[PDB]
Amino acid sequence: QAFQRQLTALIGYDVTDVSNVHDDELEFTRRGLVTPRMAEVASRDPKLYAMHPWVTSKPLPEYLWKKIANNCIFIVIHRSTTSQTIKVSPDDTPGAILQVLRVCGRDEYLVGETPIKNFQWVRHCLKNGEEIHVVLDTPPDPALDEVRKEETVSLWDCDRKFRVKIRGIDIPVLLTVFVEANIQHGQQVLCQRRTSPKPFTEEVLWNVWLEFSIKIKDLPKGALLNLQIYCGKKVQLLYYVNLLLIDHRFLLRRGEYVLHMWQISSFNADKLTSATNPDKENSMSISILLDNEMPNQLRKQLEAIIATDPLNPLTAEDKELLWHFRYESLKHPKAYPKLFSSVKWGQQEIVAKTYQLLARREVWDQSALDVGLTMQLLDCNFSDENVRAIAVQKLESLEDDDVLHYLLQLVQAVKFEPYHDSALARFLLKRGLRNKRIGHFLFWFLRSEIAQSRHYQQRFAVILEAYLRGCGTAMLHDFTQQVQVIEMLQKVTLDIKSLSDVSSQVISQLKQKLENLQNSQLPESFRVPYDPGLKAGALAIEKCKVMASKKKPLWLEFKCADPTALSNETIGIIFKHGDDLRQDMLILQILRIMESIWETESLDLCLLPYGCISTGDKIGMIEIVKDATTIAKIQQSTVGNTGAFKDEVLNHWLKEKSPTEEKFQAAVERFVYSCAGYCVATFVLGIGDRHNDNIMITETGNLFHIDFGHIKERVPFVLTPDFLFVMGTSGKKTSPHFQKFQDICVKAYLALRHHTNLLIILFSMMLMTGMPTSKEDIEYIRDALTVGKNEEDAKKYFLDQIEVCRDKGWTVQFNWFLHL
Numbered sequence: 001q002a003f004q005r006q007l008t009a010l011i012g013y014d015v016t017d018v019s020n021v022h023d024d025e026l027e028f029t030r031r032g033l034v035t036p037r038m039a040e041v042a043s044r045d046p047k048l049y050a051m052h053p054w055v056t057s058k059p060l061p062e063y064l065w066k067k068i069a070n071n072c073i074f075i076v077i078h079r080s081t082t083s084q085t086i087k088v089s090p091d092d093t094p095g096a097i098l099q100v101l102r103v104c105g106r107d108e109y110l111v112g113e114t115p116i117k118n119f120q121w122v123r124h125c126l127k128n129g130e131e132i133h134v135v136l137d138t139p140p141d142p143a144l145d146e147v148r149k150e151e152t153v154s155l156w157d158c159d160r161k162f163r164v165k166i167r168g169i170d171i172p173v174l175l176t177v178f179v180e181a182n183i184q185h186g187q188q189v190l191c192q193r194r195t196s197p198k199p200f201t202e203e204v205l206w207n208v209w210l211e212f213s214i215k216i217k218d219l220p221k222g223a224l225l226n227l228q229i230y231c232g233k234k235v236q237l238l239y240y241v242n243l244l245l246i247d248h249r250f251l252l253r254r255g256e257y258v259l260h261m262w263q264i265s266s267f268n269a270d271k272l273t274s275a276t277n278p279d280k281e282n283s284m285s286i287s288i289l290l291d292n293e294m295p296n297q298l299r300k301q302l303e304a305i306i307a308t309d310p311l312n313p314l315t316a317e318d319k320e321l322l323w324h325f326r327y328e329s330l331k332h333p334k335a336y337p338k339l340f341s342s343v344k345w346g347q348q349e350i351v352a353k354t355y356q357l358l359a360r361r362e363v364w365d366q367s368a369l370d371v372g373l374t375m376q377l378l379d380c381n382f383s384d385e386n387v388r389a390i391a392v393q394k395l396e397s398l399e400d401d402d403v404l405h406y407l408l409q410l411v412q413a414v415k416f417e418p419y420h421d422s423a424l425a426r427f428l429l430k431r432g433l434r435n436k437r438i439g440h441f442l443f444w445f446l447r448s449e450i451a452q453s454r455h456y457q458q459r460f461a462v463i464l465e466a467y468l469r470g471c472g473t474a475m476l477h478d479f480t481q482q483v484q485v486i487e488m489l490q491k492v493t494l495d496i497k498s499l500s501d502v503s504s505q506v507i508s509q510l511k512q513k514l515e516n517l518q519n520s521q522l523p524e525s526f527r528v529p530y531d532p533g534l535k536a537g538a539l540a541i542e543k544c545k546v547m548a549s550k551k552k553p554l555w556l557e558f559k560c561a562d563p564t565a566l567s568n569e570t571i572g573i574i575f576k577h578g579d580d581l582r583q584d585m586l587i588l589q590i591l592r593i594m595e596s597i598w599e600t601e602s603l604d605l606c607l608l609p610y611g612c613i614s615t616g617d618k619i620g621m622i623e624i625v626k627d628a629t630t631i632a633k634i635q636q637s638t639v640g641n642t643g644a645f646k647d648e649v650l651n652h653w654l655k656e657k658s659p660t661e662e663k664f665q666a667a668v669e670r671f672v673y674s675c676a677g678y679c680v681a682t683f684v685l686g687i688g689d690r691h692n693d694n695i696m697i698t699e700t701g702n703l704f705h706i707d708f709g710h711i712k713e714r715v716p717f718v719l720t721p722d723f724l725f726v727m728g729t730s731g732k733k734t735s736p737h738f739q740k741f742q743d744i745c746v747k748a749y750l751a752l753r754h755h756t757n758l759l760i761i762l763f764s765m766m767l768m769t770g771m772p773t774s775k776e777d778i779e780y781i782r783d784a785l786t787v788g789k790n791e792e793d794a795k796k797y798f799l800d801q802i803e804v805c806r807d808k809g810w811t812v813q814f815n816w817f818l819h820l
């Protein structure tokens, strides 16, 4: 039982607790997840698990090939104080041809049957212009990863109409009010019934049967009884709660329920949860009782429909066509979301035909994996397990590198699962247990939601517990260490915040508190949650500070615990309270996806998606990007504390940080690319109009936006005169670098548009699961990606945007200044 107490603290929630359930679905899931855990445990190669090689099968891009010399990769190998360099061909395997080679300063290994060109660490060095420093080391013992040993009427024979008794609602404290009861499947309301309005007192009783038109034999599995409370005095939603009509054992839900409801403040994933509100003492409750072959024009119309984006709404006509031409639609994997949205789920014979249809998915099974298409099947529009499972079926072929690219949003998509035990939850379980890097991030992503989502903490806790019981003792200790450190640091972060430029007493107290944590509480070393390779050590109390800001975040710097670390660079972590860093995580992850897209078209845009992990309610950690300052500061340094800005200061800031001409122009080139990435990426994501104290530049030219979890003459993005002066453009001219900037944006924008469907789905999912949203909010990226339009035309559009900034110059940057 002591092991369970550890799990609870690691998880941040008590999975054995049953104080907020009305059935045993959670416990059933615990027991259900035992098998796929042990299958993965018993199957993983202990030695490859222990070393967790971070590897990709993608080609090395054109931008990384043209950085090689005569098919030669230099790899410095170390012993104790040995440093002997080797000539290696890209195709050389480490655990054979290089003769375990751990990376210097990192928990990262160049091992296994893949060439060195295909290790992400090696590609990381090639990109930045660094060298491959490895250390001959003993392999880490797989015994350390050891895992603690463990231990009657049919539904389709029931033509009776479904009914639910609304006994009444009850609220301790506090105009009229009524109950709406929807049978839902996906976001689709199948059947809706309301009560009569009554006066809104602390108790309202109806004692009324709501008889629905849908038959019990017609309720599809995963149908939700969605109970909602509205008020008049033109109504308004005030509370909601859901109840699965068919439970986890395929039994029709039967009997008395007192469901504690959620309060409002709309596609928001929280609306879909089957979790009841656990705050029984303040929350509105509701009491219920359940006691129960084609023509040519048609082909072209069908093809036009199949070709539209995931946010083009299907008409009744559209759906009827897809459904009638079911089998022709089944030949086109891109049709699948629309076809399955053309299914009348409230009709048992249609669902049966849909299931027949699903048994003929040769073309789907044979199709190359499209993540975009696959993600759409995992969104809120699909509640059927068999549809959703063909989505997860395709995810199974993702190599680990790609799982990590999509992990955050795969974890978020668990929120769209009807049941706690799902093919998706088990896929994430499986892939996390097969790979320590996936498992590490799975821990934190799951934990991020467990700590601040009442709506989904129970589900995620069960999944996280199931992961933890298979990750192996080493990772348990390891995770335990990390949680203890962030709890210590979050405490210091919050305490300093209460004590409010940063005054004398603040700078005094912080450093004492850091010195007090250092001397007793803090461990020898711990893993950096956002960069599991890096192990942090002792604080550099010297270098730690608090921002002259209203949120008063902590800038912390640590020593690297790893003696074999080559640099002297500290590990920098910002701890901040006040911002919802879930939104940042999501945006930063989409920026990583955008980078991998660009990579497929051999385009680098040098984005800087810095590490960020939400650890709790409005709280978390941000990776310190070293040698960087804000653009706003670069203007204040030369111009003044509070004044509007001059065009030359950024370029002449860049100049004064660049030592040689070789490294300066590099900075300017790096900046042209960087500026282009963020102009395209922020435009697409609709977060481009930012005050320049939320844009940053490195000493080596790399522009990057920060502080995403925030967001009248406007601007599509930020391409200010100071950015344009670095390119060399005095108001209305055209430099060589600017035409190249214009060049790069266009190719980047068109590159994103080639994955339009993927981006639309990730943007939709982002809004639904991390931004508490409307259809019109979601439909921004359609316009941003100029859906339906041609290359030439989308290119004009984007150039027109580049010029909108030019027309405005400084007006919005300055209009912020006044506001702020």
Ligand SMILES: Cc1ncccc1-c1nc2c(Cl)cccc2cc1[C@H](C)Nc1ncnc2[nH]cnc12
Pocket: 545, 546, 547, 548, 553, 554, 555, 574, 610, 622, 623, 624, 625, 626, 628, 629, 630, 633, 693, 706, 707
């Ligand atoms: C580094 C910096 N330069 C100029 C202006 C502000 C900052 C800065 N200072 C901070 C302090 Cl003193 C404490 C806590 C957080 C701070 C954040 C910043 C800047 C605004 N942001 C970042 N600075 C460095 N790395 C980052 N990664 C993500 N965001 C950043």
